[model samples]
Target: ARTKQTARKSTGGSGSSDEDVVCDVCQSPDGEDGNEMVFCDKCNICVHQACYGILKVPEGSWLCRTCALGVQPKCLLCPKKGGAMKPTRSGTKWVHVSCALWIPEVSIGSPEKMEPITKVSHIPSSRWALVCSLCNEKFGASIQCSVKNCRTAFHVTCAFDRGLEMKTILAENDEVKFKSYCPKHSSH
Candidate 1:
């Protein structure tokens, strides 16, 4: 109820409508395939095929995983509203599917399926205490530098602003791994 309310406020730029129709994952109206947006008939949340990893668009109405399962939880990774989300390992909290892939200390039990997000507590307390140099906010989790012994803590958005590089190495069996580095060491 309140989650959908927050979803609209953030999507206020979506123009006048009873609801905003934008990709919840990429937060864009444009899409790669012919179908730009797919809405969960249940909750009306919109998403893109590539953004949500949907290989096939259902001919009939669709329901987002959350709505289909009848549980709604706010994203623990980011303050952003209305994206594809999943319950954590403990099942007490929820996080965006993309967030689990990006956060340094967090990982999916089944990378193939991208669920059971774990290793959150693996992050150091000091990293959370450090304010993002770019955003200057202590809130939300921060990722550290890949360089050895470097004390860099940056939030995902801040890292994007400060030249965080995400390189991909596709593994066998259709799995993929990503490499990232801080501004100071990205080019090195």
Candidate 2:
């Protein structure tokens, strides 16, 4: 059984460790020790990037323990509610599905403009519970609504609207580089 360590309080960030802080998993500070480092957004704890074995960081900033563990005194997304998530280092950052929804530009698009159907169940259950349309990985609780005409479903994390739109707009009308969001990575 895992013994819960009493959380430590630090005013600085996890990267501020004085001992050339090594990734607890790979024991490498460079994060290439076949391991990575994630900073908890809530507290100053540094966990090994590979220890959770979920998130892979090719680049950009990641969350730390305090932020990821869901133990914050107040939810950043729902300030009135106490956070209930456990900290996870597997991903580059610990992100809550609900918290991501709070981001103004990040939520899924509205389900408008599609041909109206009188029955709601007519839409396949699979579409409603969208997996990553790009990667076939099953969608967690992060899916957003489809755009008006598009039936495609996407995980909020994987939707990457700006990236998707740029690719679509740049391509010739007929030379569409349609990339689906799920794991099979089928076309648009």
How does each model score on lDDT?
Answer: 0.62, 0.35
Candidate 2: segments with Cα more than 4 A from true spot:
1-99, 102-128, 142-146, 165-188
Where does candidate 1 have its weakest 10-residue lDDT segment?
A: 1-10
The C-alpha local distance difference test score for the whole of candidate 1 amounts to: 0.62
Per-residue lDDT tens digits for candidate 1, residues 1-188, read 11121224564574334355555554444544343466678877676655454556777767777887788666665544555886778779877765665675777776334567788777667757777666776576766676789877766545543556644466888565645577777874
TM-score of 1: 0.56
Error of 1 at 17 (Å): 21
Per residue, candidate 2 scores C-alpha lDDT tens digits across 95-177 of 33223322222222221211111222233455435554555555343333324445555543344422332112225552222
What TM-score do all the candidates reach, one by one?
A: 0.56, 0.26
